[PDB]
Write a protein that binds this ligand. Sequence first.
Ligand code: ZN
Ligand code: ZN
Lengths: 7, 52
Amino acid sequence: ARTKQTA
Amino acid sequence: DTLCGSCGGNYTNDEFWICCDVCERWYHGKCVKITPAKAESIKQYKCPSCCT
Ligand SMILES: [Zn+2]
Ligand SMILES: [Zn+2]
């Protein structure tokens, strides 16, 4: 899936 | 900036976010209850709203 990971 | 399809909250890079492959809304992982690990075992993600 499309995600934005934690920095 | 982008707003969570669930709570209206702002994107911040200290939070995990995930996108629905059907409606393409962006969500807090916490709002739709998907962890980074859970999302790894998911191909096409269907958000709770889209499961209805
Ligand atoms: Zn949210
Ligand atoms: Zn959806």
